[PDB]
Write a protein that binds this DNA or RNA. Structure first.
Lengths: 214, 138, 214, 138, 138
RNA sequence: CUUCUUCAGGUUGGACAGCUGG
RNA sequence: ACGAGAACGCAGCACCAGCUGUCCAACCUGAAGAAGA
């Protein structure tokens, strides 16, 4: 059925998933973050999380080498994240979703905005001139409750798939999610991870929840 | 649906035409920092107020009500306080707020206690930034 | 006897049903969504909703797997969605309709358009170079009130038919409706699911509503 | 049915030819930056302006009224404000706006206040996009 | 009649032969990309242009006037604008329009401004598509 | 007592295309 | 005072049934809020 992988993304540092500079208020920051159009809440796109997790897992399943196309990854990667191969198209077992900011009430009661404006500059070594730079980042401590849908295409290869999912989640821990992660932004910390059954009940779900929570 | 820059402020038009005229007047005769001096405003000296206004706009756009809540009113009071602070810091922001009737717009928004009043105020702020960058900038 | 299935489809995330991309003016988004030609309102085609619901329901009803042609589905799937076999032509009991969004006024209250533009890139792995792209999505929070006509042919299996219909709606809530679903898009929700009699009265319409509401 | 450019005029039939000549003039004499550098405008540079134009085009076309509504005109004035902002942000975008007549056409749409003038303005911007991608592209 | 195609004209007894010749010359030494070709055009690359031409043909065929009205000339001008659009959107369409002179025929129709000129252009376009299929297709 | 408010680089690619029945 | 007079080629029939505009893809890369004497 449709096992739902739930959890929460916690920003250890500021996160900058790049949104368009346009389609927003005039006179805002030069480089803004992607937001939900209606609620204006900061957003973690499902595509960005999927792409980062797939890049990290495919690299770890290929002994730290990734110079191939996405369709030429490992079998577990192709079955979890889908494939568009001419020979055989694999429907992705993982369904990512756009993640809205969730702890806005606590940010309100702590008197902090959802996003912080970062002050940066670049200084030349030939000349002591520093070019000012304006970058927007979602403040640290921002929670992001997500829901990843999982497909039970095969029941034998589900524990391995969830072990790969946990490995991908843990690879994001020692890495950034989006934007300027080279310079300290985008650190995330998965927490309250769990798996639930969408419809009815599923046996041995406790085994998957055990290899997912820790 | 209308605040007072001194003449009028309609949603349909002249929320950017009055920004036209304010920026043209500022460029007509720039501020005099000192008797033997020449001064020109830089957009980096409005940035704090812009951030506060954008944050309050984000807070108020998700409301199915006309009157702004008490927390939003405190945020607008903060906006006015920051206006005073950043105007007193460099006395060219003083000229910018005086000639644009920006503090007057703040007071009118506080008096009206309506969401559309603050939306039109934010539209005028965007117009001011846009037309300052157009003719001048830097 | 004929029945009408009322309800609303709420976009939890942005939805993207692929458009024509040949008649949406000049200088529009790269990949547009399908819209009503007259009102320019984004819509969920009845064909796409029917196809997704049929796929999910046929996969879940049969064994959890589905590899056959659409005409070789179960009896329930064939009697609900129709069949075009040689000697077994089932007349579909469900008549899907194109679903335009209704809460354009609600969206315009928040000063947001019905559709957004989502910026995505693909990072070539052998070069580590990004390839930005733009797509159009119907923003999350859009509502699509739909109407599905049910032909009450056999009184002995209307309860089972509506159990299957509710199950298909539930399966759609743990999947996506059209577009780049695995990459964060297309998540929908169902509420206000009520069935009414088109003409006259149905003596088991209260049981149908409670299995369509739970 | 007829929008002004200054000396020259644009009607419902000659919009494409005028857009083509405006684009050809730009490609024949490309804009030169401060550091002696020639630059070509990108569709992404004016993408926000174009989407704002199309956003209000959808609501104008779903209106069989000669006179534009107050909120539609508010949206169009905001579009002009955004055009000015993007011109002030990038000198090359400002050069593109000045060589064409986006500002002149949009203010003539504000002047005429009528549904058909905005439709011809949208036709002109579409033809400008088409002929810009025809010669140089993104 | 006497529709100019740049080099050689066409009339009611000529359009099919030149359409077939242009299509055959398309298949002989076809288009080459930057990466050495080697694809040809498809119907779902000029389908929008063809639909616009079909709509204008339907509009003209219901009029008995020998001279095209300005409301139809606007449609033909938009057809030319769109042809310029997909010509610059992809070079596989640009050379298709150049060698099978859609633009020259459109300009000649927009100059003659007559019903018969556009009818001859429509017949030429229909023959062009008909010979494009049965030789290529897709 | 000093000025820079951002500069530089990428800007869509590949696949399917109508098949069954009267 | 015409091989002619009178005589509807007419009646019943849904261009219809089945089919997701889908699959793959991080808005990404580099940048000391910093310096006279």
């Amino acid at each position: 059925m449709k096992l739902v992988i739930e959890g929460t993304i916690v920003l250890k540092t500021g996160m900058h998933i790049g949104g368009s500079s346009d389609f927003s208020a005039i006179g805002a920051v030069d480089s803004p973050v992607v937001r939900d159009t209606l609620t204006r809440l900061p957003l973690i796109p499902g595509s960005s999380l999927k792409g980062k997790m797939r890049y990290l897992l495919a690299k770890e399943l290929n002994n730290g080498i990734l110079l191939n196309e996405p369709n030429n990854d490992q079998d577990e990667i192709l079955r979890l994240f889908g494939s568009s191969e001419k020979d055989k198209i694999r429907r992705a077992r993982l369904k990512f979703n756009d993640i809205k900011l969730s702890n806005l009430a606590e940010l309100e009661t702590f008197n902090v905005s959802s996003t912080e404006v970062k002050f940066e500059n670049t200084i030349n070594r030939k000349t002591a001139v520093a070019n000012p730079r304006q970058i927007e980042r979602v403040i640290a401590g921002s929670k992001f409750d997500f829901e990843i849908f999982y497909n039970l295409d095969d029941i034998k290869e589900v524990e391995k798939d969830f072990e790969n999912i946990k490995q991908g989640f843990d690879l994001l821990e020692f890495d950034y999610l989006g934007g300027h992660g080279t310079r300290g932004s985008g650190r995330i910390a998965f927490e309250n991870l769990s798996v639930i059954t969408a419809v009815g009940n599923f046996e041995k779900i406790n085994t998957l929840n055990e290899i997912l929570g820790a | 649906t209308e605040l007072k820059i001194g003449n009028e402020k309609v949603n349909s038009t002249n929320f950017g035409d009055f920004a036209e005229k304010a920026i043209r007047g500022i460029n007509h005769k720039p501020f005099v920092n000192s008797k033997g001096g020449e001064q020109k405003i830089t957009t980096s000296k409005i940035r704090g107020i812009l951030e506060l206004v954008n944050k309050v706009y984000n807070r108020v756009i998700n409301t199915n009500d006309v009157e702004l809540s008490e927390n939003i009113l405190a945020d607008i009071a903060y906006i006015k306080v920051k206006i005073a602070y950043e105007s007193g810091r460099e006395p060219v922001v003083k000229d910018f707020i005086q000639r644009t009737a920006f503090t007057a717009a703040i007071t009118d928004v506080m008096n009206q206690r309506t969401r559309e009043s603050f939306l039109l105020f934010a539209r005028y702020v965007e117009s001011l930034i846009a037309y300052f960058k157009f003719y001048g900038g830097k």
